[PDB]
């Protein structure tokens, strides 16, 4: 029998947040899947949400698939460039499109982030049933601010714009909470399915993405848990990562970089509200996990779970952004929030709060990696991932084999017994996957799907990375780095601390040749101004 697929994507979830990845957050459902299955410590996405999602559903690079940069920040020199359409384009065929023509029922409940228009919806791109938030974010409870000319651009670009199949929804149900709605709808779709054929179920949550909001009864369970702050947390996470074997005992963690005040410099009220945000984040993750459990438990009781290839991943590094630091997200984001939301301590986490936890809490979760979401350093692109599928021999272990989100489409096609159509589909020229099927690796035939010569590129917001085997070069422009290529031996220096550019100049040179080919193969275009902070 052909397996089902359950692909679950967390939004900005950090590497050590889940219990089985070193965390204190209650994630019993995910833990059971992770420990029975295979946990990946060297699995990679892109550095941000829509690029990663375009890659996950195609098996190629986001510069080819239509999200060369995030739609919400297209500049004039980028608009019109191929692969910079801002939605999943027609130079690619999506995974669900291919599975649906081979008898799979394609079911989705969650965030899309691959296009806002009718012809760009899940329904248009191969899902027979879908309940979706089309934008990159929204209020989890559906509470909208006033929308007019003076509304901060980041809020304007994150309305609660939901579709069910072809229908743009006019209202949301009472009690709507994103993660619960997604669990509800996917459970409905599964209970309504044709039980005699397999399903591809896509469960992209919007949690734990800002605004940080969760049911009070779950937030209450974390009361006081984070009082010692984000650096105390980082140490707990490092200790546990080492104890669990997820990182080597000796690893040197990258130093925490933030323009904010450190915990001990904060006044009591400020601390209280920052801890409250992390208590809410934790509740988001636990409630996500709970909804995952509802899905998995239904499949299990149906006797289908063991014939379901279950993949869980985050879509990028933990979110260390200060939304208030980007003029593009304004004008006056904090002033608008102060006049429309209540972020007083007691309200944080409810529908009419709007918070993000910032760079220090984010780096607790990405440690020992460098930085966080929207950087090309490991903090931005190395994400937690697990595969639970008991037909595959390689289960019960922690694997440090290199893998990327582009591997997923070819793996699932393989298992479905479906061939990628090649260079043409529905009469148009399409890209072929850049990833490689994990089947050989996971079946124990090989030690990894890739090898010491595998070459993989990243480029977004003017940052770059280029990796071959365990050698990685990184380029971070001003003001966030030296605007020169830095070179790291990831096997000896996972924290990207010791720049080897001067000691191994031959190796850097090769990587720069690889980078140029990447730019060439994928259509990378960098603009003047990577971004502006202020």
Ligand X SMILES: O=P(O)(O)c1ccccc1
Ligand Y SMILES: [NH3+]OP(=O)(O)c1ccccc1
Q: Return residues touching ligand X (CB under 6 A).
A: 48-49, 70, 72, 136-137, 157-158
Q: How far is the CB of 230 from ligand X (least distance, A)?
A: 20
511 binds, among ligand Y, ligand X, Ca ion, none (CB under 5 to 8 A by kind): none
- Rounded to a whole number of angstroms, the CA Rg of the chain reads 22
C-beta atoms surrounding 447 within 10 Å: 11
Q: Please, which residue, 257 or 439, has the CB nearer to ligand Y? A: 257
For every residue of 23-40, DSSP letters joined together read: --S--HHHHHHHHHSEEE
| Residue least distant from ligand Y (Cβ) | 253
Q: Burial of 502 by CB count in 10 Å (0-12 exposed, 13-18 middle, 19+ buried)? A: exposed
Q: Please, which residue, 53 or 234, has the CB nearer to ligand Y? A: 234
Q: What is the DSSP letter of 382?
A: B
72 binds, among ligand Y, ligand X, Ca ion, none (CB under 5 to 8 A by kind): ligand X
Strand runs labelled E in 11-104: 38-40, 43-44
Footprint of ligand Y on this chain (CB under 6 A)? 235, 238, 252-253
Q: How far is the CB of 372 from ligand Y (least distance, A)?
A: 17
158 binds, among ligand Y, ligand X, Ca ion, none (CB under 5 to 8 A by kind): ligand X
Footprint of Ca ion on this chain (CB under 5 A)? 11-12, 49, 315-316
Q: Please, which residue, 155 or 455, has the CB nearer to ligand X? A: 155
Bridge partners of 5, per DSSP, are 200, 309
| Residue least distant from ligand X (Cβ) | 136
Bridge partners of 455, per DSSP, are 468
Q: Please, which residue, 130 or 316, has the CB nearer to Ca ion? A: 316
Paired tokens of 174: 């009472």
Q: How far is the CB of 445 from ligand X (least distance, A)?
A: 36
Q: How far is the CB of 49 from ligand X (least distance, A)?
A: 3
Q: How far is the CB of 13 from ligand Y (least distance, A)?
A: 22
137 binds, among ligand X, ligand Y, Ca ion, none (CB under 5 to 8 A by kind): ligand X
Q: Please, which residue, 261 or 391, has the CB nearer to ligand Y? A: 261
Q: Please, which residue, 235 or 260, has the CB nearer to ligand Y? A: 235
Q: How far is CA 13 from the centre of its chain?
A: 7
387 binds, among Ca ion, ligand Y, ligand X, none (CB under 5 to 8 A by kind): none
Q: Please, which residue, 37 or 157, has the CB nearer to ligand X? A: 157
Q: How far is the CB of 253 from ligand Y (least distance, A)?
A: 4
Q: How far is the CB of 488 from ligand Y (least distance, A)?
A: 16
Distance, in Å, from the CA atom of 360 to the CA atom of 371, rounded to the nearest integer, reads: 10
Q: How far is the CB of 244 from ligand Y (least distance, A)?
A: 15
Paired tokens of 394: 């390689």
219 binds, among ligand Y, ligand X, Ca ion, none (CB under 5 to 8 A by kind): none
352 binds, among ligand X, ligand Y, Ca ion, none (CB under 5 to 8 A by kind): none
Q: Please, which residue, 179 or 437, has the CB nearer to Ca ion? A: 179
Q: Burial of 326 by CB count in 10 Å (0-12 exposed, 13-18 middle, 19+ buried)? A: middle
For the CA atoms of 376, 121, 524, 408, the dihedral, rounded to the nearest 10 degrees, stands at 60
70 binds, among Ca ion, ligand X, ligand Y, none (CB under 5 to 8 A by kind): ligand X
Cis peptide, bond prior to residue 196, ω within 30 of zero: no
Paired tokens of 501: 């550019």
Q: Please, which residue, 79 or 227, has the CB nearer to ligand X? A: 79
For the CA atoms of 388, 392, 393, 398, the dihedral, rounded to the nearest 10 degrees, stands at -30
253 binds, among ligand X, Ca ion, ligand Y, none (CB under 5 to 8 A by kind): ligand Y
Q: How far is the CB of 205 from ligand X (least distance, A)?
A: 12
Q: How far is CA 57 from CA 65, 89, 115, in A?
A: 9, 12, 13
Paired tokens of 173: 């149900």
C-beta atoms surrounding 123 within 10 Å: 20
For every residue of 233-293, DSSP letters joined together read: HHHHHHHHHHHTTSS-TT--PPPP--SSPPGGGS-HHHHHHHHHHHHHHHHHHHHHHHHHH
Q: How far is CA 284 from CA 150, 305, 532, in A?
A: 30, 25, 30
Q: How far is the CB of 228 from ligand X (least distance, A)?
A: 28
Cis peptide, bond prior to residue 523, ω within 30 of zero: no
Q: Please, which residue, 79 or 252, has the CB nearer to ligand Y? A: 252
């Amino acid at each position: 029998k052909r397996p089902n697929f359950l692909v679950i994507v967390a939004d900005d979830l950090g590497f050590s947040d889940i219990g089985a990845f070193g965390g204190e957050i209650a994630t019993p459902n995910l833990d059971a899947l992770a420990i029975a299955g295979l946990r990946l410590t060297d699995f990679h996405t892109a550095s941000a949400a829509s690029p990663t999602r375009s890659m996950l559903l195609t098996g190629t690079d986001h510069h080819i698939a239509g999200i060369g940069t995030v739609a919400e920040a297209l500049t004039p020199e980028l608009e019109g460039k191929p692969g910079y359409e801002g939605h999943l384009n027609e130079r690619v065929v999506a995974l669900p499109e291919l599975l649906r023509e081979a008898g799979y029922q394609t079911l989705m409940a969650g965030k899309w982030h691959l296009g806002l228009k009718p012809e760009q919806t899940p329904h248009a791109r191969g899902f027979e049933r879908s309940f979706s938030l089309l934008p990159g974010a929204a209020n989890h409870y559906g509470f909208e601010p006033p929308y007019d000319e003076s509304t901060p651009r980041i809020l304007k670009g994150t309305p609660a714009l939901y579709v069910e199949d072809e229908r743009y929804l006019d209202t949301l149900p009472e009690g709507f909470y994103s993660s619960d709605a997604f669990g509800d709808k996917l459970l409905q779709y599964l209970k309504e399915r044709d039980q005699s054929r397999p399903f591809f179920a896509y469960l992209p949550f919007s949690a734990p993405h800002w605004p940080l909001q969760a049911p009070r009864e779950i937030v209450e369970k974390y009361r006081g848990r984070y009082d010692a702050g984000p650096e105390a947390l980082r140490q707990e996470r490092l200790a546990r990562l080492k104890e669990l074997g997820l990182v080597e005992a000796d690893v040197e963690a990258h130093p925490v970089l933030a323009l904010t005040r450190e915990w001990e410099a904060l006044e009591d009220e400020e601390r209280a509200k920052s801890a409250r945000a992390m208590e809410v984040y934790a509740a988001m993750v636990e409630r996500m996990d709970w909804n995952i459990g509802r899905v998995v438990d239904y499949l299990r009781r149906q006797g289908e779970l063991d014939n379901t290839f279950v993949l869980f991943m985050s879509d990028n590094g933990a979110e260390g952004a200060l939304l208030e630091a980007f003029p593009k997200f304004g004008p006056d984001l904090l002033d608008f929030l102060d006049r429309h939301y209540d972020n007083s301590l007691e309200n944080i986490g409810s529908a009419n709060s709007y918070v993000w936890y910032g760079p220090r809490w984010a780096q607790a979760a990405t440690a020992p990696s460098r930085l966080y979401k929207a950087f090309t350093t490991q903090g931005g692109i190395r994400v937690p991932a697990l595969v639970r599928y008991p037909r595959l021999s390689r289960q019960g272990a922690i694997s440090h084999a290199f893998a990327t989100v582009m591997d997923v489409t070819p793996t699932l096609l393989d298992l479905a017994g479906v061939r990628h159509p090649g260079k043409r589909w529905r009469g148009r020229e399409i890209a072929e996957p850049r990833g490689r099927s994990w089947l050989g690796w996971l079946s124990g035939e090989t030690e990894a799907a890739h090898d010491e010569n595998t070459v993989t590129g990243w480029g977004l917001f003017g940052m770059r990375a280029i990796r071959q085997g365990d050698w990685k070069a990184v380029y971070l422009p001003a003001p966030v780095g030296p605007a020169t290529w830095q070179l790291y031996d990831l096997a000896r220096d996972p924290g990207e601390i010791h720049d080897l550019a001067d000691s191994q100049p031959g190796k850097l040179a090769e990587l720069i040749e690889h980078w140029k080919r990447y730019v060439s193969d994928t259509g990378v275009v960098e603009g003047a101004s990577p971004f502006l902070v202020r």
